[PDB]
Amino acid sequence: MASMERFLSVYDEVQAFLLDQLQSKYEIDPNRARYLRIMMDTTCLGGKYFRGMTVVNVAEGFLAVTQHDEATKERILHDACVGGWMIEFLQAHYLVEDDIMDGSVMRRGKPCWYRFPGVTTQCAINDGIILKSWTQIMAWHYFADRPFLKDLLCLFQKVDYATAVGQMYDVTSMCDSNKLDPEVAQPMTTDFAEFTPAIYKRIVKYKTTFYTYLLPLVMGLLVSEAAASVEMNLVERVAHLIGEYFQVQDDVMDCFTPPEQLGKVGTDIEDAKCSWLAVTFLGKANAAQVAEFKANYGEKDPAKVAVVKRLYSKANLQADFAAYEAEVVREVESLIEQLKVKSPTFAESVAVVWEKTHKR
Amino acid sequence: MASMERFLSVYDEVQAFLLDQLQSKYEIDPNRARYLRIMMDTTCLGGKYFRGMTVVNVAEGFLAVTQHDEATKERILHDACVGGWMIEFLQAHYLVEDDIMDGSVMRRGKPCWYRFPGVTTQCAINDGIILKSWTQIMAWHYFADRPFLKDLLCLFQKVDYATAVGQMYDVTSMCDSNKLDPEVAQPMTTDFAEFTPAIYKRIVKYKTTFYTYLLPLVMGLLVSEAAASVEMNLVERVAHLIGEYFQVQDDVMDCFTPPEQLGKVGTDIEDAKCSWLAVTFLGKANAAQVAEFKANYGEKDPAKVAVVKRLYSKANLQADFAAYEAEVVREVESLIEQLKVKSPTFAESVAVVWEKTHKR
Ligand SMILES: NC(=O)NOCc1ccccc1
Ligand SMILES: NC(=O)NOCc1ccccc1
Ligand SMILES: [Zn+2]
Ligand SMILES: [Zn+2]
Ligand SMILES: [Zn+2]
Ligand SMILES: [Zn+2]
């Protein structure tokens, strides 16, 4: 069986399990079940499944080098599929809630869930809650008797909590820290003193890298009973590094990729986000350029937005990007080498994750 | 040590643990830590702590009849306090998110969290997420080596998921089920065919009873290693029964308790909620009364709201309430008796929970 067709099949099986349980154990009626089926499909399907498929790809790597009965091979692959859906549903939770938090309009060429006419914010906040609850229902059902259940739940928790803390770093990134105060409406920064590489790195490390790269890699090791084939400090280091690069690319596309190709209208400039572009621009600007940036950033006025894009264009940010990219290629190849000492197979899976990131 | 002073002390200890970890493990800065300290205090403190204190009271019951070293007595009580805070933080999560979902203005005489000037919806949805993540952090830290960790996590999950499903039942209670559809804006019901006792019971069972009554009772049994002192089908039956009564009282106060005493302006009529009052009124109304109710319910116009209150007044709903109350007194005393067969101590704790509910 090809990997993607297995993965997709297990989605149908998990969906049926979750909705059947709603009827047998939680007293749901058929119409509300249909509403939740449609919510699940709309929010969990239609991406490339990079995160969930990484679990499967890691587990396939280890199957090629480890002796097992066929039925054990099938159970491992079924577990890797379930685990990969846990991650896809976790991402679904964060996309639904973030879209509401940020007042987003589109995602992937389609309206954000909360904007569907028979959804609304009142339902969509709760639908998002349900998405994440379903990850837990999956784990407790499919992994009830598994030796890795404890470790898997404990890892999942920490990643989820890191991700929520990262959303906090993200949404407060344009405020002055010393002015955070629940009692006082928050002004945009005027000095941009906090738009630094180290601060930017903390936002991206927490908001994206834990659930996009660390979790799929480590879940693949857990369902394979292979955590001893790695030095977990290296896996964490490589995960954060690759995931930082992934976000830098996303930051650049938000500004420069046309909307029909991007699948939405990017608003990072208007939203005054601490993007890689803003931070890099500030790291090389002269006094007059910094003043012009300050007079135009974080404003909805499209002429002021065009002024910011113009500043980024004139500033030759493509060169700082190629230099960044060069250095990440360097450090990732180094980390992969360190991974080969305990597991060529795992190092190869990390290689594949890097290639899919670097070339998308 | 008195129970409440222990409980309160453990809040300070848990808070310090959670914020210290944010600094040592999640790279937080002092200002964001202060923001989260204030969020925790504002959202978790100021109620009566009925749910968390019930864990402690159940555990105290068993301590009186079970032999233990003093250090074991202290560990059980510390565990019951932590467990009771897990429940209080879980309720905090649902209050923050529900207030946003329902566009609530006040809670307990104070603005809803999302309405604080330096919060806003964009932060408050995520703050609510964090609240529930903190319940998990507590359990994995304080109960890491405990024999009941698995059972406690598995119970907590199911209760949380029941609660989210109950919010779904609640927010869709004024729609016709056969018309639920993410693609189509949802009209209010015109026939009110779904305002029935059984439908009402399903909303309340899921939305409130699992986290308010089942969870504190069962968590008390788990931290005491006492689940064998009960027949879990009875505990579930009594929990749902008491919790249904609790919500019927809440439904009546939303309509009839003055706002300064209620701590908010009740809007169940304007929001077309399936309340006990609406369902009971419809169960006894003549044709003309049903037509007048239909012409006035679910409308913000205060004259139409006063028409609905007038219908409920003339309909002598206080008599149906006294009759309901009588029957619940009857069934609860019966269930307590059945609980005495395996545990007088546990039956007594259930007695106390009932008294606090019945007389508030
Ligand atoms: N639906 C129902 O009544 N019970 O299923 C959920 C559940 C919650 C807590 C403890 C055990 C089960
Ligand atoms: N903050 C950090 O870098 N690590 O702490 C969180 C964490 C997440 C996943 C696995 C293990 C730990
Ligand atoms: Zn966002
Ligand atoms: Zn972006
Ligand atoms: Zn509500
Ligand atoms: Zn109410």
PDB file of N, CA and C in Angstrom, chain B residues 89-141:
ATOM      1  N   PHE B  89      -9.566  25.524  36.978  1.00  0.00           N
ATOM      2  CA  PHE B  89      -8.952  26.067  35.760  1.00  0.00           C
ATOM      3  C   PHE B  89      -9.714  25.594  34.512  1.00  0.00           C
ATOM      4  N   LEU B  90     -10.264  24.379  34.551  1.00  0.00           N
ATOM      5  CA  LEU B  90     -11.061  23.871  33.436  1.00  0.00           C
ATOM      6  C   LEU B  90     -12.342  24.751  33.277  1.00  0.00           C
ATOM      7  N   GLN B  91     -12.958  25.050  34.381  1.00  0.00           N
ATOM      8  CA  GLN B  91     -14.151  25.899  34.375  1.00  0.00           C
ATOM      9  C   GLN B  91     -13.726  27.265  33.880  1.00  0.00           C
ATOM     10  N   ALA B  92     -12.605  27.767  34.341  1.00  0.00           N
ATOM     11  CA  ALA B  92     -12.075  29.089  33.857  1.00  0.00           C
ATOM     12  C   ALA B  92     -11.947  29.171  32.337  1.00  0.00           C
ATOM     13  N   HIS B  93     -11.411  28.107  31.732  1.00  0.00           N
ATOM     14  CA  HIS B  93     -11.306  27.937  30.250  1.00  0.00           C
ATOM     15  C   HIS B  93     -12.700  28.091  29.642  1.00  0.00           C
ATOM     16  N   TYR B  94     -13.661  27.294  30.090  1.00  0.00           N
ATOM     17  CA  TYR B  94     -15.006  27.358  29.509  1.00  0.00           C
ATOM     18  C   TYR B  94     -15.722  28.704  29.727  1.00  0.00           C
ATOM     19  N   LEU B  95     -15.508  29.379  30.865  1.00  0.00           N
ATOM     20  CA  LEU B  95     -16.112  30.714  31.106  1.00  0.00           C
ATOM     21  C   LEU B  95     -15.528  31.785  30.195  1.00  0.00           C
ATOM     22  N   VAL B  96     -14.204  31.811  30.033  1.00  0.00           N
ATOM     23  CA  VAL B  96     -13.558  32.764  29.115  1.00  0.00           C
ATOM     24  C   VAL B  96     -14.094  32.520  27.688  1.00  0.00           C
ATOM     25  N   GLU B  97     -14.060  31.293  27.220  1.00  0.00           N
ATOM     26  CA  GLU B  97     -14.427  31.053  25.816  1.00  0.00           C
ATOM     27  C   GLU B  97     -15.963  31.265  25.591  1.00  0.00           C
ATOM     28  N   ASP B  98     -16.788  30.811  26.521  1.00  0.00           N
ATOM     29  CA  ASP B  98     -18.243  30.999  26.417  1.00  0.00           C
ATOM     30  C   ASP B  98     -18.623  32.463  26.404  1.00  0.00           C
ATOM     31  N   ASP B  99     -17.959  33.232  27.246  1.00  0.00           N
ATOM     32  CA  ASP B  99     -18.245  34.694  27.315  1.00  0.00           C
ATOM     33  C   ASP B  99     -17.952  35.311  25.960  1.00  0.00           C
ATOM     34  N   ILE B 100     -16.854  34.929  25.294  1.00  0.00           N
ATOM     35  CA  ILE B 100     -16.567  35.394  23.972  1.00  0.00           C
ATOM     36  C   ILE B 100     -17.589  34.884  22.984  1.00  0.00           C
ATOM     37  N   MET B 101     -17.878  33.567  23.013  1.00  0.00           N
ATOM     38  CA  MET B 101     -18.840  32.972  22.063  1.00  0.00           C
ATOM     39  C   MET B 101     -20.218  33.696  22.136  1.00  0.00           C
ATOM     40  N   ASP B 102     -20.665  33.984  23.362  1.00  0.00           N
ATOM     41  CA  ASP B 102     -22.057  34.468  23.597  1.00  0.00           C
ATOM     42  C   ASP B 102     -22.107  35.977  23.593  1.00  0.00           C
ATOM     43  N   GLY B 103     -20.997  36.664  23.419  1.00  0.00           N
ATOM     44  CA  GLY B 103     -20.915  38.110  23.516  1.00  0.00           C
ATOM     45  C   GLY B 103     -21.359  38.634  24.847  1.00  0.00           C
ATOM     46  N   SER B 104     -21.045  37.914  25.934  1.00  0.00           N
ATOM     47  CA  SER B 104     -21.359  38.363  27.269  1.00  0.00           C
ATOM     48  C   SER B 104     -20.618  39.596  27.668  1.00  0.00           C
ATOM     49  N   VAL B 105     -21.229  40.354  28.572  1.00  0.00           N
ATOM     50  CA  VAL B 105     -20.727  41.625  29.035  1.00  0.00           C
ATOM     51  C   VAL B 105     -20.078  41.588  30.405  1.00  0.00           C
ATOM     52  N   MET B 106     -20.778  40.965  31.354  1.00  0.00           N
ATOM     53  CA  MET B 106     -20.312  40.842  32.720  1.00  0.00           C
ATOM     54  C   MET B 106     -20.366  39.390  33.165  1.00  0.00           C
ATOM     55  N   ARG B 107     -19.554  39.093  34.167  1.00  0.00           N
ATOM     56  CA  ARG B 107     -19.651  37.840  34.899  1.00  0.00           C
ATOM     57  C   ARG B 107     -19.311  38.130  36.355  1.00  0.00           C
ATOM     58  N   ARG B 108     -20.210  37.810  37.304  1.00  0.00           N
ATOM     59  CA  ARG B 108     -19.889  37.997  38.765  1.00  0.00           C
ATOM     60  C   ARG B 108     -19.642  39.497  39.034  1.00  0.00           C
ATOM     61  N   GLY B 109     -20.478  40.388  38.520  1.00  0.00           N
ATOM     62  CA  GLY B 109     -20.267  41.809  38.816  1.00  0.00           C
ATOM     63  C   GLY B 109     -19.056  42.470  38.145  1.00  0.00           C
ATOM     64  N   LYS B 110     -18.277  41.764  37.287  1.00  0.00           N
ATOM     65  CA  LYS B 110     -17.074  42.356  36.663  1.00  0.00           C
ATOM     66  C   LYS B 110     -17.086  42.085  35.148  1.00  0.00           C
ATOM     67  N   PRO B 111     -16.349  42.880  34.363  1.00  0.00           N
ATOM     68  CA  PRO B 111     -16.375  42.692  32.912  1.00  0.00           C
ATOM     69  C   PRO B 111     -15.843  41.285  32.576  1.00  0.00           C
ATOM     70  N   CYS B 112     -16.387  40.698  31.530  1.00  0.00           N
ATOM     71  CA  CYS B 112     -15.806  39.450  31.027  1.00  0.00           C
ATOM     72  C   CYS B 112     -14.350  39.713  30.627  1.00  0.00           C
ATOM     73  N   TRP B 113     -13.470  38.705  30.775  1.00  0.00           N
ATOM     74  CA  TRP B 113     -12.075  38.881  30.472  1.00  0.00           C
ATOM     75  C   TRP B 113     -11.728  39.518  29.123  1.00  0.00           C
ATOM     76  N   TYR B 114     -12.383  39.071  28.062  1.00  0.00           N
ATOM     77  CA  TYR B 114     -12.090  39.540  26.754  1.00  0.00           C
ATOM     78  C   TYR B 114     -12.349  41.061  26.612  1.00  0.00           C
ATOM     79  N   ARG B 115     -13.192  41.586  27.485  1.00  0.00           N
ATOM     80  CA  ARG B 115     -13.568  43.042  27.437  1.00  0.00           C
ATOM     81  C   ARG B 115     -12.609  43.935  28.193  1.00  0.00           C
ATOM     82  N   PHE B 116     -11.634  43.370  28.917  1.00  0.00           N
ATOM     83  CA  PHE B 116     -10.632  44.179  29.551  1.00  0.00           C
ATOM     84  C   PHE B 116      -9.821  44.981  28.509  1.00  0.00           C
ATOM     85  N   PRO B 117      -9.517  46.245  28.769  1.00  0.00           N
ATOM     86  CA  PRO B 117      -8.954  47.028  27.673  1.00  0.00           C
ATOM     87  C   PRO B 117      -7.657  46.533  27.001  1.00  0.00           C
ATOM     88  N   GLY B 118      -6.744  45.912  27.780  1.00  0.00           N
ATOM     89  CA  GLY B 118      -5.466  45.424  27.261  1.00  0.00           C
ATOM     90  C   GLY B 118      -5.491  43.919  27.003  1.00  0.00           C
ATOM     91  N   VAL B 119      -6.672  43.332  26.950  1.00  0.00           N
ATOM     92  CA  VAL B 119      -6.856  41.915  26.563  1.00  0.00           C
ATOM     93  C   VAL B 119      -7.291  41.789  25.102  1.00  0.00           C
ATOM     94  N   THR B 120      -8.561  42.063  24.849  1.00  0.00           N
ATOM     95  CA  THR B 120      -9.225  41.933  23.582  1.00  0.00           C
ATOM     96  C   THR B 120      -9.447  40.465  23.179  1.00  0.00           C
ATOM     97  N   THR B 121     -10.325  40.228  22.223  1.00  0.00           N
ATOM     98  CA  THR B 121     -10.696  38.869  21.825  1.00  0.00           C
ATOM     99  C   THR B 121      -9.469  38.143  21.290  1.00  0.00           C
ATOM    100  N   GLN B 122      -8.620  38.845  20.561  1.00  0.00           N
ATOM    101  CA  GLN B 122      -7.470  38.235  19.938  1.00  0.00           C
ATOM    102  C   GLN B 122      -6.596  37.555  21.020  1.00  0.00           C
ATOM    103  N   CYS B 123      -6.371  38.191  22.147  1.00  0.00           N
ATOM    104  CA  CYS B 123      -5.610  37.536  23.211  1.00  0.00           C
ATOM    105  C   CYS B 123      -6.473  36.571  24.017  1.00  0.00           C
ATOM    106  N   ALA B 124      -7.729  36.931  24.285  1.00  0.00           N
ATOM    107  CA  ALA B 124      -8.526  36.209  25.264  1.00  0.00           C
ATOM    108  C   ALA B 124      -8.833  34.761  24.780  1.00  0.00           C
ATOM    109  N   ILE B 125      -9.048  34.562  23.479  1.00  0.00           N
ATOM    110  CA  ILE B 125      -9.281  33.157  22.953  1.00  0.00           C
ATOM    111  C   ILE B 125      -8.052  32.318  23.359  1.00  0.00           C
ATOM    112  N   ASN B 126      -6.864  32.849  23.107  1.00  0.00           N
ATOM    113  CA  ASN B 126      -5.623  32.110  23.461  1.00  0.00           C
ATOM    114  C   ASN B 126      -5.428  31.995  24.927  1.00  0.00           C
ATOM    115  N   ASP B 127      -5.720  33.000  25.693  1.00  0.00           N
ATOM    116  CA  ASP B 127      -5.647  32.877  27.176  1.00  0.00           C
ATOM    117  C   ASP B 127      -6.513  31.709  27.721  1.00  0.00           C
ATOM    118  N   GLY B 128      -7.700  31.568  27.119  1.00  0.00           N
ATOM    119  CA  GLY B 128      -8.568  30.499  27.450  1.00  0.00           C
ATOM    120  C   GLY B 128      -7.958  29.138  27.125  1.00  0.00           C
ATOM    121  N   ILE B 129      -7.326  29.016  25.978  1.00  0.00           N
ATOM    122  CA  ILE B 129      -6.562  27.814  25.572  1.00  0.00           C
ATOM    123  C   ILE B 129      -5.499  27.494  26.642  1.00  0.00           C
ATOM    124  N   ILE B 130      -4.728  28.511  26.990  1.00  0.00           N
ATOM    125  CA  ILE B 130      -3.692  28.345  28.017  1.00  0.00           C
ATOM    126  C   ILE B 130      -4.293  27.811  29.317  1.00  0.00           C
ATOM    127  N   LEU B 131      -5.387  28.404  29.832  1.00  0.00           N
ATOM    128  CA  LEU B 131      -6.076  27.912  31.034  1.00  0.00           C
ATOM    129  C   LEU B 131      -6.249  26.404  31.038  1.00  0.00           C
ATOM    130  N   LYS B 132      -6.688  25.869  29.896  1.00  0.00           N
ATOM    131  CA  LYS B 132      -6.948  24.434  29.911  1.00  0.00           C
ATOM    132  C   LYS B 132      -5.578  23.706  29.819  1.00  0.00           C
ATOM    133  N   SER B 133      -4.615  24.276  29.125  1.00  0.00           N
ATOM    134  CA  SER B 133      -3.283  23.588  29.039  1.00  0.00           C
ATOM    135  C   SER B 133      -2.664  23.485  30.424  1.00  0.00           C
ATOM    136  N   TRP B 134      -2.813  24.479  31.258  1.00  0.00           N
ATOM    137  CA  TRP B 134      -2.297  24.480  32.580  1.00  0.00           C
ATOM    138  C   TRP B 134      -2.859  23.313  33.466  1.00  0.00           C
ATOM    139  N   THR B 135      -4.115  22.876  33.219  1.00  0.00           N
ATOM    140  CA  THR B 135      -4.659  21.732  33.942  1.00  0.00           C
ATOM    141  C   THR B 135      -3.773  20.519  33.677  1.00  0.00           C
ATOM    142  N   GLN B 136      -3.359  20.335  32.425  1.00  0.00           N
ATOM    143  CA  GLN B 136      -2.517  19.222  32.060  1.00  0.00           C
ATOM    144  C   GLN B 136      -1.093  19.305  32.648  1.00  0.00           C
ATOM    145  N   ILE B 137      -0.538  20.530  32.641  1.00  0.00           N
ATOM    146  CA  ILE B 137       0.758  20.731  33.189  1.00  0.00           C
ATOM    147  C   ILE B 137       0.707  20.359  34.648  1.00  0.00           C
ATOM    148  N   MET B 138      -0.305  20.818  35.394  1.00  0.00           N
ATOM    149  CA  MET B 138      -0.469  20.420  36.801  1.00  0.00           C
ATOM    150  C   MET B 138      -0.471  18.941  37.008  1.00  0.00           C
ATOM    151  N   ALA B 139      -1.245  18.211  36.237  1.00  0.00           N
ATOM    152  CA  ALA B 139      -1.428  16.766  36.455  1.00  0.00           C
ATOM    153  C   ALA B 139      -0.056  16.032  36.196  1.00  0.00           C
ATOM    154  N   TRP B 140       0.571  16.334  35.080  1.00  0.00           N
ATOM    155  CA  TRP B 140       1.840  15.674  34.690  1.00  0.00           C
ATOM    156  C   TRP B 140       2.932  16.022  35.673  1.00  0.00           C
ATOM    157  N   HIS B 141       2.930  17.232  36.271  1.00  0.00           N
ATOM    158  CA  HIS B 141       3.930  17.513  37.261  1.00  0.00           C
ATOM    159  C   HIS B 141       3.626  16.902  38.608  1.00  0.00           C
TER     160      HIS B 141
END
